[PDB]
Amino acid sequence: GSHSMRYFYTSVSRPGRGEPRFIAVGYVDDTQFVRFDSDAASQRMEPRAPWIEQEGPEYWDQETRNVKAQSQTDRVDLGTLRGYYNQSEDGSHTIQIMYGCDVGPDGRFLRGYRQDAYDGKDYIALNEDLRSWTAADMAAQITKRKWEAAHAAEQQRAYLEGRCVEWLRRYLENGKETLQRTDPPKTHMTHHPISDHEATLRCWALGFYPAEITLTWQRDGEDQTQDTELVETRPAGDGTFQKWAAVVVPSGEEQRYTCHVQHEGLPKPLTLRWE
Amino acid sequence: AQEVTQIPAALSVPEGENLVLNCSFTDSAIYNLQWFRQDPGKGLTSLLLIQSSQREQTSGRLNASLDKSSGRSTLYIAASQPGDSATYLCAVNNAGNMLTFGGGTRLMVKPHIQNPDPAVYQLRDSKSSDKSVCLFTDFDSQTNVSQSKDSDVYITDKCLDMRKSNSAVAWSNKSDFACANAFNNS
């Protein structure tokens, strides 16, 4: 299977309540491995996965320095963007940053990404070719010129195709017993009469890793995606995931419906029918 | 962390000769690398600033290179002159550590003494006292002056271009102290 490393930064201004809230989290696939919280007592990058704990003091000192540098950059950028948008000093504002690299099963680079938001809206993003920026408005356009003058795209591309891919490969090897495991979904179907003439069929997938799964309902063989209740894939809290899909069917016509489960851990896609 | 190193820490070279000053750093993820000049008791002068993408910068007889794959920068100085004599500091800027300095290299460009004529002379005080000093002068730049092995006799290090002449000074309150038997040099 193909893998990703992703970092997520949230900065929220707190006017009259001291410094902005800064939260940084690192992921390999759907597993968090590092965190930083400005409001925590440590003021250190902290491990959140067992396999990162074996990184030495130099790693933790480096990631702490660099994450603090990012928090300081965000503190400045909150002030700058407040200026760009002619906003008052008494309102809370949010900067969000996401970046990361994807590698195929062979461990080779597939793609990289860098995206920035202001108050939950696109601000600036690195293009697919990793050579140029797309600015959302005139404010972001001023940023784009500053980033072009710093040759930021060259450095982002260098990171995403170099250190990002190299460290992801290292993490994948060190944590392979969890990160590179394939747990197939434990599947079952429940039946709950709504009335005398209708009933909900719910198709369950439990204890699966990674998070990527397809649950689909068919009526005699035809897909029913537009009449299917499909909850977001959710973490069980033990590192596995859960999902269900439901359809409301006429009573007596239950066996005309099939739930289809596709997961990497399955050697054969499953077809479930009420028994 | 970022550790910047400059070995050797001191260099002596004859004027006219080309020289290399060394700089190494442990973190190759940098904004830019800077070479400074510092004269004794003075501040910093930026000579060259190399960007992370740039491989070298040039200003006249100064040329600095950058290799991030080995984490090294060398400053090349062509046709070295006595006026090049100063402390040269290497500094690398990055997000985590900010502008981080090496220990520096003290460069001494030794002037060519065309006609060396090493002699010791006795100089009397311009005021009407009985005080005098000894002057060792006109020795070649290959001659060094050492510390006094007598606590009652003071001897200076060496440093003169009448637009060249090396000199050292010796003095003492001892009455038997003779300028002829004053100096001890290498």
Place this chain on the structure above:
Amino acid sequence: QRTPKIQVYSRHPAENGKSNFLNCYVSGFHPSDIEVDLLKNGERIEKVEHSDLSFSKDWSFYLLYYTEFTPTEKDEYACRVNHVTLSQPKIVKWDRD
């Protein structure tokens, strides 16, 4: 502004008298400020942990709130969420079935 989606569920299939974990997964919300409480018979559960703030491709935030719990026949479990986008604090009852 985006309204939180709320899922309340057990880590393992519920069995009365067997130690388990109670999850409240809150996603699709903006801004980041949110109040989440796990309830036992309407009462706030004290020892509750939560994941570090992260977000999806659309910039909407998600958090996992969880605590150790022992499901019984009679004890009602629920998640209470307050967010600026909500009219009222939203209480979602745990439905094991």
Place this chain on the structure above:
Amino acid sequence: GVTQTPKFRILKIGQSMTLQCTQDMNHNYMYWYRQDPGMGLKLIYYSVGAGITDKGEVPNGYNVSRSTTEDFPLRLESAAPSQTSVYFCASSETRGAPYGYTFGSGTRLTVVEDLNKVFPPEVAVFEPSEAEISHTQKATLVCLATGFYPDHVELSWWVNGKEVHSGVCTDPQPLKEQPALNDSRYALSSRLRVSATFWQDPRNHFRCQVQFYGLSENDEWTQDRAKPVTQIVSAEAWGRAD
């Protein structure tokens, strides 16, 4: 650019002082470094904007504040011997500083056990040797500054009321008069070489000027001898034909 004060200060052990550092360039980033003899600059404290400060490499024994964009003062609450150093303030528009940091001229701080051990230099000019003149047709004057503490002086030569650089070389550093003693007074020599013709003329005037950095006017003094304040001590010699 960046203005820092004072240029120089002697502190007794335990005394407090504040180093001022100002810039009117609206720079978010301000820095404090210290430099020991024959070493590089070490970051003490930095600020990424008004109302925040963060420890550098060597923050121990110092405090800073950033109430405004303009000012980044460094505080010493209790002077210790280890804080004898040269202090450089700096600023930058961005963290990346593509133009490099803007540096202040520097502050030399000397911490002493006893202010009564501060002495200005005595200065003497020694006349060129008759033996040198006859052998080389050149004439070397020697200036000797002696008995000064602490060790920071600036020696300059003035010929007929004008500063000269040609034919001048000064000792790279002062020597200790009592090399065993920690609070030893210092000596420094300089040479000025001129033609035998220039020396052997009574109209020509040669002055050795020693700028001494000492106590300030706000320092207390109980000794009979003159307060060893920041002062210029000179000795002058005139040419001679005889």
Place this chain on the structure above:
Amino acid sequence: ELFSYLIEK
């Protein structure tokens, strides 16, 4: 490992 080439907006 974090990205470290930080340019202000």
